[PDB]
Amino acid sequence: FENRVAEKQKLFQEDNGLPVHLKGGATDNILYRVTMTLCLGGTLYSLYCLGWASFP
Amino acid sequence: QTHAYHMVNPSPWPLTGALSALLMTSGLTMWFHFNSMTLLMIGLTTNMLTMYQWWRDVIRESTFQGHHTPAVQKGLRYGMILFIISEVLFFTGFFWAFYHSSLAPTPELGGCWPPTGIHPLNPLEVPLLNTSVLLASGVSITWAHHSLMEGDRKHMLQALFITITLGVYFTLLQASEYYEAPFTISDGVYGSTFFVATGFHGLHVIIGSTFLIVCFFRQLKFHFTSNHHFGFEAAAWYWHFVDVVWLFLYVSIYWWGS
Amino acid sequence: YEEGPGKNIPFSVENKWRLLAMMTLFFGSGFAAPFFIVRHQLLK
Amino acid sequence: GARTWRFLTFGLALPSVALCTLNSWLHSGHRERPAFIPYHHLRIRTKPFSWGDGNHTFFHNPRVNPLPTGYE
Amino acid sequence: MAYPMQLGFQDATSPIMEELLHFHDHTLMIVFLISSLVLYIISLMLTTKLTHTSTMDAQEVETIWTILPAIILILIALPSLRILYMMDEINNPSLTVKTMGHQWYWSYEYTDYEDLSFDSYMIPTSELKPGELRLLEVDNRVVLPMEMTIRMLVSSEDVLHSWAVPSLGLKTDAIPGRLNQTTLMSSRPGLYYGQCSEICGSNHSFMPIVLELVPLKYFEKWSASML
Amino acid sequence: ITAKPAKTPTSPKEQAIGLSVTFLSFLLPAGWVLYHLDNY
Amino acid sequence: MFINRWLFSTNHKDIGTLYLLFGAWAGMVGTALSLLIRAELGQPGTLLGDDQIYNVVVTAHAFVMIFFMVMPIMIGGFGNWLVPLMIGAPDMAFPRMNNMSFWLLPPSFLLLLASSMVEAGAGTGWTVYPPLAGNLAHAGASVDLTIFSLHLAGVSSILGAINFITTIINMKPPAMSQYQTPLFVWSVMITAVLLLLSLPVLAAGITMLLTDRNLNTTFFDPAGGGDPILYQHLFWFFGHPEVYILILPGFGMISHIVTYYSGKKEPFGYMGMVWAMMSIGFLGFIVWAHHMFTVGMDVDTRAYFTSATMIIAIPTGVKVFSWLATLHGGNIKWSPAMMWALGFIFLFTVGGLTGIVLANSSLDIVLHDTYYVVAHFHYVLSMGAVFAIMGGFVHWFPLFSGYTLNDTWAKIHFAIMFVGVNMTFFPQHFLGLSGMPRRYSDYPDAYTMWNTISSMGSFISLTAVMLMVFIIWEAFASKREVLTVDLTTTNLEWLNGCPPPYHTFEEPTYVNL
Amino acid sequence: GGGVPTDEEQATGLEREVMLAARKGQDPYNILAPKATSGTKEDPNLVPSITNKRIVGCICEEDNSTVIWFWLHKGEAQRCPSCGTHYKLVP
Amino acid sequence: YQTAPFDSRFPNQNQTRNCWQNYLDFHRCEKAMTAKGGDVSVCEWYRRVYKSLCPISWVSTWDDRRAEGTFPGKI
Ligand code: HEA
Ligand code: HEA
Ligand SMILES: CCCCC/C=C\C/C=C/C/C=C\C/C=C\CCCC(=O)O[C@H](COC(=O)CCCCCCCCCCCCCCCCC)COP(=O)(O)OCCN
Ligand SMILES: CCCCCC/C=C\CCCCCCCCCC(=O)O[C@H](COC(=O)CCCCCCCCCCCCCCC)COP(=O)(O)OC[C@@H](O)CO
Ligand SMILES: CCCCCCCCCCO[C@@H]1O[C@H](CO)[C@@H](O[C@H]2O[C@H](CO)[C@@H](O)[C@H](O)[C@H]2O)[C@H](O)[C@H]1O
Ligand SMILES: CCCCCCCCCCO[C@@H]1O[C@H](CO)[C@@H](O[C@H]2O[C@H](CO)[C@@H](O)[C@H](O)[C@H]2O)[C@H](O)[C@H]1O
Ligand SMILES: C[C@H](CCC(=O)O)[C@H]1CC[C@H]2[C@@H]3[C@H](O)C[C@@H]4C[C@H](O)CC[C@]4(C)[C@H]3C[C@H](O)[C@]12C
Ligand SMILES: [Zn+2]
């Protein structure tokens, strides 16, 4: 393999105001949206599960 | 700023981590009592997504953005040491459980250790092979460390590959020994102490092996310098911790407890 | 981010009467919860 | 040096693993399972397991792990 | 038993409970004195307009306020441990009685000679006889000989309980799979009450203990009558 | 400590309203539950 | 912007603020639970008619007060706000991991409130002893939800301890030794070391309870050769350190408040105070079995645990006398925070002394599992932690908010609370000496007078809590903006103004050697 | 056998700035404790700043546990209010 | 015989092993005596001690397990 660290340093130091978790580009936004959707949706489902289990 | 410390970009991973904890625990609840794995499989997935993105961002902040000054690296050194201490005290509780049960075997056991009807594994067979494997991996990871410090890319990769191979060998041997064992987790306090203590150790071997594989790919991608490679040091310290816990299990449970 | 008195908090203090409503609901919901938990357990 | 730790890896550590691998290899082969005795401190069931029929351990081996009622 | 508006311990029924009373008086004097001295010194520090705000040297005074507390702790520890070892000393019992805790009642076994055993349940409030004590009376009392060293052995057939009789200075946890020993000696005839002293579920409040202390001859005839 | 006078002074009447509303937010819901215990 | 700031924080001040809001909300839940306890006991007979619900209320009261009120306020709230400011650090070592310590607590709290809502709750006591907490006597999800609540609170505080130790060791000005850090910073470092070592042992024990309940292990089940008493050792190996964890940051805040309102530049005997906190922390690991004097342990073991427990009075005495020596010669300012601190010194001393009574195993036989123990810990822990929290809250509110409290209202609040807690807890000594068990829903008739007075006291503290909410409202409603603070030369946390900017110490302090 | 980058080749951002300044004996990110002068009005302690004020902590005597904190402003030397040691801002 | 005397092998609050040891000793002795067809009366001391100390449910459970072949002690 070849050392491509300098090209990743240029990408992550680009003066575009993006936070580090989104600075890789469009793929970061997708994986973020998948993660937060599963967390928030999962959490709403856990509250439904509590509602169900709170009664006999 | 005219200090050397890292002001971290606002991050969603602490929240996704906290919610993954909620989904894993409520999921285990739903699996043990309401016959369903759905919540648990969502929690495990979000937990793996959180860990991936969080440690990805740490690599972005250090290798790619240069935020790991000597002061920041010194902090991560303390954080990893303190994390390892907390894991030692966790194992201490299981060792206490083991010594408590085995030093004063109750009448239900036949008043002896090992209990009546327990046929322990021979400590000189696969458990001794496992000891040789983890000790060997402590030597190979040390070779990997010195190769990296000396600027030797090929030997660092070969040594670290050997170390991971031994971690996998240990894990496959242990899986095999679990399957072959004539006793189970339900075989009283002997099975309870054996499987829970070696089981948490097994999990730590898988976590440590995963950490080493992360270091292997980062090395392939040239992330580490001959002087700056804290992810490698942290994985090596964790790996020595896993070795040392094994030595204590081998002497206590496998040998003294047989 | 806004700095200074009334700006370093996740709730507004721009209107003392809306703030009273929000503080009422916040502390009130916490104090009420155990009474409604007991009611729940008694009604099963 | 890396040179010394490589010397130890190939000269001592892996030869040890090879010797213990030989030792394990030679002492393998299935030993005879003991007479089933329904001891009350073994095959504990206070709650069904959350998988299978509730009565099988997670890495149940029919050859060497009896159920509470005996070998399958 | 306790009486209304009681401040201190139930009157001692056993010599060891007498010892604990005298030890508590000694300890409580020390607690009163230290409490009072701290409140007085607070009030002394807070009642002058005179000031001294420069750096104060601490080492002379820190000797006083480590050594004096060390001596006070030794003066508590010495009689404390004398009593601990006195309770533990070999007494040769005349009788062994077992109690088993259950949700939510005590059973008693007297198996030195015959197989005598019975259940002991709280009298419901609605069934108390005039003059009887709410939450304290049982149907079947633990009849025991007065003025005799008795070995009590305590266990459980379910969850943790704890077998307590405050006026005898007794509290022994009732643990399944374990046989805990204590000794009981009453100086007097009478009725001595206690209450389950380990949270054991929804009727923890309602599984009391009643000892009935009588002459040996009466204990023997009661025992025979209970077979 | 020193401080400015209140930018939005809370008169005695305003304080009686805030104190009353605060106390009621604690007392009414718990009171409703305890009053209805028999019914539960 | 709101989500980035309050859900995605990497800022020690905003995370401190999240912890204070969480802990205040938790305090309302824990107070309601406490009032239900005292309502059941306020007259003879049954109020709830369901003692499983009484036991659930008692259990939840303790978990909420300990895990969701005291630890988040003292460590998460004051610790995150003050520690970086007091050492001139720009933030915590792990500012993103810090946010996860915070966000683990709402889910932990949700699992506890789920435990109480499913089946018949966990009516176990906060000790969660098997076999009562086992899958026979507590069948169903309630105890497992309680275990998982503790797991998440445990991870929160372990990662928090790693953060505080790293920050305090690594992020001081290079000229500043550990012996030039303020006592509050010492108190948080020592508390963090106790959490780091103690919580993993709790985690191991409650994990064993989980596996006994769900995977047919028998750690605590005699039928498999287990032992209920092993659970008790693992729990209290954690639980004694935990009670020092609950008071140490309070000791730290009391040192600062007494120093400040005495008009002193420094507490009396700084190195003695450091010595005392480290000694308490160490001895705190070797005394746990004083929670087990009635389980049937050997006489020599009881003699050791009695002796080792009494030793803690020596360093603790050094602190109490050092606080009085700090007042000595002070220009005393009778602020509401000083009143809280003086109430702390007195009430902590009373509770500490009843702990020395309990350390005597012989006397503990008769006092164990009685209201004497409840009286001891509501003095030393309940009033101690709460008085230090209220002192620190009234002292630093203007730093955190940029606004002043009404001092007259805050003095009224103190006076009501002082009356209420003493009326509540002092009579519980008489109930314990005279033999009233703890964890009871009802009592023999003789115990009526003290239970009646205790329950009437509980309503007085309720009035104080309601007034406290009004007082905080009045401060934000009126907006009196802070101008000057005295003694900034020995109170660095004030020197960046009220409130300090989002980013402080971007340019670090200059300290030469 | 080579192929591992050095800090000189691959360090970036603030890590690199700290690396390059240290080679020159310079400390722009405040990693080292400054050495006191005699602290007289003639020989004041020189306090670098990127702004017109900076907080000074004064440990007046060796092993004092109490640090004395104050803002040092651009202009005339100021004195520690405890020991009178002189400090002068050099923006 | 009034009750089981103090036994210096078991001097502590936990008397579980005292009950267990005397139960084992009785049944070992009864087997050794029945086997040669000697007299079980030599075993009487062990019998009186375990009957005094042992909970009825423990003896009952141990007796059932000896008859089942699941008693885990050596007799
Ligand atoms: C803030 C929390 C906190 C603190 C700091 C303490 C401090 C102490 N505690 Fe307490 N304790 C609890 C919280 C706390 N405790 C809780 C929650 C429980 C019960 C848990 C449960 O069952 O739910 C408990 C239970 C508990 C027990 C078990 C009782 C039983 O269940 O039977 C004992 C036994 O020794 C004990 C003792 C002590 C002692 C000796 C100290 C010492 O550290 C006190 C030292 C202080 C002083 C002594 C006062 C100041 C000193 C002087 C003025 C110097 C001079 C003094 C002398 C010479 C004596 N406590
Ligand atoms: C910190 C710990 C703590 C606190 C504060 C309290 C507070 C109170 N507790 Fe207790 N309690 C325990 C810990 C605590 N408790 C524990 C561990 C048990 C044992 C449980 C078991 O047996 O398993 C227990 C048990 C217990 C019992 C015994 C139950 C039984 O044995 O059956 C009783 C009886 O009266 C009692 C009452 C009260 C009362 C009336 C209050 C209060 O009402 C007293 C007044 C205090 C307040 C009202 C607090 C206000 C604080 C806030 C609102 C926060 C504000 C926040 C900011 C400013 C940022 N509690
Ligand atoms: C090669 C070793 C690798 C280990 C990975 C294997 C499986 C799952 C994960 C293991 C994690 C470790 C320990 C958890 C407890 C039990 C598992 C012990 C190890 C194991 O795998 O034990 C098996 C039983 O597994 C069982 O019950 C399986 C039960 C599965 C459910 C797990 C329950 C989760 C518990 C929650 C963890 C709490 C975490 C606390 C965090 C601390 C925070 C402060 C043994 O099989 P057997 O058929 O009984 O005997 C063999 C007979 N031929
Ligand atoms: C598949 C099985 C599922 C089970 C769940 C857990 C599974 C797997 C987890 C595997 C752990 C992987 C951790 C990868 C961390 C990568 C980030 C990293 O290593 O980051 C490094 C910093 O270290 C750091 O943060 C150090 C951060 C270290 C944290 C790791 C600790 C182990 C985590 C244990 C987690 C759960 C344990 C629970 C058991 C009860 C970056 O600095 P450098 O390396 O100096 O580089 C910079 C140079 O390039 C400059 O020249
Ligand atoms: C990204 C957002 C987050 C995603 C949330 C998704 C929520 C949807 C989950 C579907 O719900 C499932 O329904 C099944 C029934 O249809 C249940 O089966 C289980 O319950 C059945 C009920 O009888 C039983 O047969 C068995 O336990 C078992 O099959 C199962 O438990 C439950 O999970
Ligand atoms: C521990 C915390 C609790 C402290 C004590 C609370 C103090 C009481 C506050 C008032 O609470 C209310 O009291 C009313 C009665 O006074 C109730 O009305 C009830 O009774 C009225 C009079 O009979 C009826 O008109 C209403 O319909 C009926 O709901 C009402 O529901 C309830 O909210
Ligand atoms: C040819 C390549 C060079 C990589 C590079 O310098 O970019 C070499 C260097 C070290 C090699 C690795 C190590 O020699 C160890 C392993 C040896 C096995 O025979 C193949 C896989 C194995 C994991 C190798 C993969 C790959 O061929 C590597 C990575
Ligand atoms: Zn100076």
Author numbering:
A (entry chain J): 1 to 56
B (entry chain C): 4 to 261
C (entry chain L): 3 to 46
D (entry chain G): 12 to 83
E (entry chain B): 1 to 227
F (entry chain M): 1 to 40
G (entry chain A): 1 to 513
H (entry chain F): 3 to 93
List sentences quoted exactly from the publication behind this structure.
pmcCytochrome c oxidase (CcO), a terminal enzyme of the respiratory chain, catalyzes oxygen (O2) reduction coupled with the proton pump, generating a proton-motive force across the membrane. Mammalian CcO consists of three mitochondrial DNA–coded core subunits (subunits I, II, and III) and at least 10 nuclear DNA–coded peripheral subunits. The electrons from cytochrome c are transferred through CuA in subunit II and heme a in subunit I to the O2 reduction site, which consists of heme a3 and CuB. It has been proposed that the hydrophobic channel that connects the transmembrane surface of subunit III through subunit I to the heme a3–CuB site is the O2 transfer pathway.
The FO − FO maps of CO2-treated–untreated and N2O-treated–untreated CcOs in the fully reduced state showed clear residual electron density in a site (site 2), the same as the Xe2-binding site. Therefore, we assigned the electron density to a single molecule of CO2 or N2O. At site 2, CO2 or N2O was oriented to form weak hydrogen bonds with both the hydroxyl group of Ser108I and a water molecule (Wat2). In the FO − FC maps of CO2- and N2O-treated CcO in the fully reduced state, elongated electron density was observed at a site (site 6) the same as the Xe6-binding site. CO2 or N2O was oriented along and within the elongated spherical cavity of site 6. Based on the above, we propose that CO2 bound to site 2 could be passively expelled to the outside of mitochondrial inner membrane through this channel.
